[PDB]
Amino acid sequence: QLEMKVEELLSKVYHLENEVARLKKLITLMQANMATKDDLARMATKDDIANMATKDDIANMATKDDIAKLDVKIENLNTKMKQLEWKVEELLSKVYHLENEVARLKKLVGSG
Amino acid sequence: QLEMKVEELLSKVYHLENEVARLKKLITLMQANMATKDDLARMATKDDIANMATKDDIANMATKDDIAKLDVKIENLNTKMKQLEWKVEELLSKVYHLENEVARLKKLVGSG
Amino acid sequence: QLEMKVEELLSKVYHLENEVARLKKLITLMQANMATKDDLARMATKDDIANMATKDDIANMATKDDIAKLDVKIENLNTKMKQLEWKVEELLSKVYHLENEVARLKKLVGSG
């Protein structure tokens, strides 16, 4: 009777020893595979990327090279404009002298 | 006496059985709720976003459509410039012929 | 004999009590340090940043201020162009009247 209880206890303690050993095995496997709070500290949050620009946001982005190409076109038009200005100035001068010459001729010819 | 110790052991083993059972329950709950190393492998790090562009970085971005609109303005100025060039050429020609006509008249009139 | 087994069981149960206590300590430390599924839900994934624009992507970005500066250059060329147009118009008029005056003089002078 007492002896039965002791036998029962021997069996139950051996089974507990094994249950404890298996829990240790499991906890070990868990620790090797667990992400930690430190791990989380190295990670980007959703909030960290809430103001992220995407490749689609910039798909139509102009570049500094686009600006430089336009600036070249503008400088070349400025040079052409100056060249025309100079020719107009030469002509303005020639027209003024022609007007003077014609005035003199009209004085000299009168009614003919 | 022996019997007391056996009773003590019976109680202590039943309590251990329950403690072990509760630990199993807890470990189960932990495994269902644990983030894993594989989970971490799918996540973005802080380092991964260190060179991220933001929506504020691009708030003043020019576009390809801004460049196209300027280019249209530049092409239209080029056409206007050519039109003026052509009219200046016509005038240069007319001034040259007037100069010739006036020269001939001055020869024919002399001092009047 | 029975007494030996009981002594053995007493020792083994005390050691189990301590093993269980140490497992509880460990599990506690694990729970305090574990990242959770909720934690993972707050984190950015690699997939979330797959379309991220970088600071290098925008290193050559033109700005709205670059566009405004070109537009000023273009407006100023437009004004210069108009000014030249007006002077050409004045000259066209003067050339037309000179042509008329010279025609009249040629009629009046004839062969001289």
Numbering used by the authors:
A (entry chain A), B (entry chain A), C (entry chain A): 3 to 114
Sentences from the paper on this structure:
α-Helical coiled coils are ubiquitous protein domains, found in a wide range of structural and functional contexts. The structure of coiled coils is understood at a level unrivaled by any other fold. They consist of at least two α-helices, wound into superhelical bundles and held together by a mostly hydrophobic core. The seven positions in a heptad are labeled a – g, where positions a and d are oriented towards the core of the bundle and are thus mostly hydrophobic. We find that they indeed break the α-helices to form short β-strands, which associate into a triangular supersecondary structure we name the β-layer. β-Layers are found, also repetitively, in natural coiled coils, where they form regular fibers with alternating α- and β-structure, a protein fold that has not been described so far.
